[PDB]
């Protein structure tokens, strides 16, 4: 769509973008541990909570990537989890939330990250991957094509990003290595590379350094559509005494948001944040989106 003023529309920002751009090339803002908005317990909050608004407010703000972590239950279903805590949100709840958003804004698509946060219940029936692929993934809204996932194809459905081995059905982004805590780089499909910066449990100093550092590389490697760039602005720690994911989001988002503003980059990659709202000075998600002007 000829205009640039389209990126300003958070619910349909992927409309002006050509149906020929690989999802990897697009600077898509994400959300970290998305299903934690319901946490109301004060002690569970300063540790678990990384969000404050439901999946609709989330994607109604430009967010197109969701960090979904779950567990297999007795009732042969998948519920959202955070470590050994049941977050009072379910997997159906999410897919149902995205279908509604997509029926309303057909121009958009959404990448659903999925991992086995906890161990299958002591009385389940099938495996984790099987249960998901036989009871959920087997839905039409789930893009079944793979390769270098272009926008023209994912429009209207849910692009699945595997973060679990044991997958038997084709579709989405093939689950790769992904080391615990670090900035790594590995091959995805047969035609792709990934540079994931997931340095959780680190100092504020190193954290913001590592973000900007990876954001530097992508900003310069803004022409290789064969490279996926994940950037977790999220930072966790001892909570309670101002070590919570909230304390860090309040500085890191506006800070990293500015970094994008001044740099006038073309590409900033997939930026998975914490506490996506409208109270932090420049707003990270709005900046990530705007940086797609170079694509229109």
**243/222 Cα distance (integer angstroms):** 34
Question: Do residues 100 and 54 touch, judged by C-beta distance below 8 A?
Answer: no
Place of tokens 């409309």: 15
Beta bridge pairs of residue 65: 30, 111
Is 81 an annotated catalytic residue? no
Tokens representing residue 166 in the block:
């044991």
* Residue in 237, 63, 272, 247 with CA at minimum distance from that of residue 53: 63
Residues 6+ apart with CB under 8 A from 268: 27, 215, 218, 219, 231, 260, 287, 288, 291
User: Out of 61, 81, 82, 227, which one is annotated catalytic?
Assistant: 82
Cβ 273 vs Cβ 52: under 8 Å: no
167 within 8 A of 202, measured Cβ to Cβ:
no
| 32 carries an active-site annotation | yes
Q: CB within 8 A of 3, min separation 6: which ones?
A: 16, 296
Distance of CA 48 to the CA centre of its chain: 17
Q: How far apart are CA 252 and CA 202, in angstroms?
A: 13
- Per the structure, the count of domains in the chain is 1
Residue 260 in contact with residue 288, Cβ under 8 Å? yes
Burial of 123 (0-12, 13-18, 19+ CB in 10 A): exposed
**Token pair recorded at residue 213:** 């550092």
Q: Which residues pair with 110 in a beta bridge?
A: 158
> Cα separation of 248 and 271, whole Å?
15
Q: How many CA atoms lie within 13 A of 130 on its CB side?
A: 6
Rg (CA), the chain: 18
Range of the domain at 160: 1-296
**Residue 293 · residue 7 · CB < 8 Å:** yes
Torsion-angle region of residue 85: left (phi > 0), alpha (psi -120 to 50) or beta? beta
Is 201 in contact with 237 (CB distance < 8 Å)?
yes
Nearest to 149 by CA among 165, 114, 175, 173: 173
Resolution in A for the shown PDB structure? 2.6
Please count the other Cβ atoms lying within 10 Å of the Cβ belonging to residue 267.
24
90 forms beta bridges with 79
Overall size of the chain counted in residues? 296
DSSP string covering 61-99: TT--EEEEEEEE-TTS-EEEEETTEEEEEEHHHHHHHHH
Domain harbouring 280, CATH code = 3.20.20.190
Q: List C-alpha distances in Å: 184 to 136, 177, 229.
A: 30, 9, 10
DSSP alpha helix (H) spans, the chain: 42-45, 55-59, 91-104, 128-135, 151-154, 204-220, 245-263, 284-290
* Residues in Cβ contact with 42 at an 8 Å cutoff, skipping those fewer than 6 apart: none
The crossing angle, in degrees rounded to 10, of helices 204-220 and 245-263 is 30
Q: Is 287 exposed, middle or buried (0-12, 13-18, 19+ CB in 10 A)?
A: buried
For residues 292 and 18, the answer to whether their CB atoms sit within 8 Å is: no
Question: How many other CB atoms are there within 10 angstroms of residue 208's CB atom?
Answer: 19
Other C-beta atoms closer than 10 Å to the C-beta of 82 total 22
């Amino acid at each position: 769509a000829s205009s640039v003023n389209e990126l300003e529309n958070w619910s349909k920002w992927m409309q002006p973008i050509p149906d020929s751009i690989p999802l990897a090339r697009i600077s898509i803002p994400g959300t970290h541990d998305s299903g934690t908005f319901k946490l109301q317990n004060p002690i569970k909050q300063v540790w678990g909570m990384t969000q404050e608004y439901d999946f609709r407010y989330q994607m109604d703000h430009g967010a197109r990537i969701f960090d979904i972590r779950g567990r297999l239950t007795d009732d042969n279903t998948i519920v959202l989890h955070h470590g050994p805590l049941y977050l009072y949100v379910t997997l159906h709840e999410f897919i149902n939330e995205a279908k509604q958003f997509l029926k309303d804004n057909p121009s958009e698509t959404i990448i659903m990250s999925l991992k086995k946060e906890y161990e299958d219940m002591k009385g389940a029936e099938d495996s984790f991957s099987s249960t998901f692929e036989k009871k959920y993934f087997v839905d039409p809204i789930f893009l079944k094509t793979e390769g270098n996932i272009k926008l023209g194809d994912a429009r209207g459905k849910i692009v699945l990003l595997k973060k679990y081995s044991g997958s038997n059905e084709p579709g989405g982004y093939n689950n790769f290595y992904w080391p615990d805590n670090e900035t790594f780089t590995t091959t995805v499909n047969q035609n792709a590379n990934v540079t994931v910066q997931d340095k959780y449990k680190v100092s504020y100093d190193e954290k913001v350094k590592s973000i900007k550092d990876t954001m530097d590389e992508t900003m310069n490697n803004s022409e290789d559509l064969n490279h996926l760039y994940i950037n977790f602005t999220s930072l966790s720690s001892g909570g309670t005494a101002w070590n919570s994911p909230y304390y860090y989001a309040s500085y890191i988002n506006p800070e990293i948001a500015n970094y994008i503003k001044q740099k006038n980059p073309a590409r900033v990659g997939w930026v998975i944040q914490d506490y996506i709202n409208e109270k932090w000075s420049p707003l990270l998600y709005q900046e990530v989106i705007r940086a797609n002007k170079s694509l229109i």
